[PDB]
Amino acid sequence: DEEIVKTPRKLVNYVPLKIFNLGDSFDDTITTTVAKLQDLKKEILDSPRSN
């Protein structure tokens, strides 16, 4: 193990952090714009096309 004993630690030493928990990779904002465009194009499909 490390050194001879357990490493010293602060009496609180919380440090929550954990902003991201796995996942990451694909961004959410780009696909959010994608989903907005999806509902927009569905609304367009509701509007008449051709004829």
Binding site: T33, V34, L37, K41, I44, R49
Partner: protein, 48 residues
């Protein structure tokens, strides 16, 4: 997919503007046809 949906947006805008132009030109042509027939009758009467 974003490029294709933007392509459909521009396609539908061009489609709508083309139909607007087509209605404008057809309306103008029908009005001109009726006006030409009326003017032809008027000119024939005046000449006679």
């Amino acid at each position: 997919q974003e490029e294709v949906i933007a392509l459909f947006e521009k396609c539908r805008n061009k489609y709508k503007e083309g139909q607007k132009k087509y209605m404008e030109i057809d309306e103008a042509l029908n009005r001109l046809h009726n006006s030409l027939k009326a003017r032809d009758q008027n000119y024939k009467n005046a000449e006679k």
